[PDB]
Design a protein around this ligand. Structure first.
Ligand SMILES: CC(=O)N[C@@H]1[C@@H](O)[C@H](O[C@@H]2O[C@H](CO)[C@@H](O[C@@H]3O[C@H](CO)[C@@H](O[C@@H]4O[C@H](CO)[C@@H](O)[C@H](O)[C@H]4NC(C)=O)[C@H](O)[C@H]3NC(C)=O)[C@H](O)[C@H]2NC(C)=O)[C@@H](CO)O[C@H]1O
Length: 203
């Protein structure tokens, strides 16, 4: 199990100022629903996956200090008709991975059997739902396959999570800096776990 290397102490050391809404046990419990997460490939692939998942979360949530996107648009894409926006509701970033947009809340809600399209706030109000949405995005959108492949691709996870705004950005631009911060956190977490991060890091 991945909890053998990401212990409560490792987690607390990485997120010392986390909002109390986010707990280690919450992540563990939610991960039980995605048995392949952190158990795919070699032990080093397992370590890289946890470092990549939590490194991306470190960037998105500000070290788990934030539950909701700070100073957000309502993120309702009217061209995305499969998952209809609910009147007055907003799909700004929520949870560890800052799940955004009606299309992600809708697909996640469908896969998780949750009322996320009509009640997106559940992601910021129920920590079990919050962790499940982060793991759901990671698995369903295939950040999992990107990082656990041989060779591993941390860059692939960034592309999938927020590539339009963070990848292929001029060096030093805000998007490029966010991208580099994800790489910095991933490599720092890999150092804690004693694993090589791989060479495919930036996008
Ligand atoms: C320089 C630096 O690193 N500053 C930090 C701030 O960046 C950080 O605030 C957080 O910033 C991130 C951007 O890195 C922002 O991210 C949002 O995240 C969601 C989810 O990844 C993105 O949604 C994706 O949208 C695309 C379409 O554009 C979809 O294709 C994709 O499916 C979506 N992904 C998911 C998982 O839903 C948003 O696009 C993205 N927003 C932007 C404009 O980039 C977070 O919301 C910010 N977090 C907070 C809490 O506001 C800040 C955190 O405290 O720390 C700074 O240091």
């Amino acid at each position: 199990s991945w909890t053998s290397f990401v212990t409560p102490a490792v987690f607390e050391g990485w997120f010392p100022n986390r909002n109390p809404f986010y707990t280690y046990d919450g992540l563990v419990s939610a991960s039980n629903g995605y048995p392949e997460f952190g158990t795919t490939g070699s032990l080093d692939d397992q370590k890289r996956e946890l470092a990549a998942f939590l490194g991306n979360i470190n960037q998105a949530s500000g070290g788990l200090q934030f539950i909701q996107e700070q100073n957000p648009s309502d993120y309702c894409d009217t061209s995305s008709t499969q998952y209809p926006c609910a009147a007055g509701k907003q799909y700004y970033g929520r949870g560890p991975i800052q799940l955004s947009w009606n299309y992600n809340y809708g697909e996640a809600g469908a896969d998780l059997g949750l009322d996320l399209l009509n009640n997106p706030d559940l992601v910021a109000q129920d920590s079990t739902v919050a962790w499940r949405t982060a793991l759901w995005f990671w698995m369903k959108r295939d950040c999992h396959g990107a990082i656990t492949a041989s060779p591993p691709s941390f860059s692939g996870t960034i592309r999938i999570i927020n590539g339009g705004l963070e990848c292929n950005q001029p060096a030093g631009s805000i998007g490029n800096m966010q991208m580099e911060n994800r790489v910095t956190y991933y490599t720092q977490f890999c150092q804690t776990l004693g694993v090589d991060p791989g060479t495919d890091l930036r996008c």
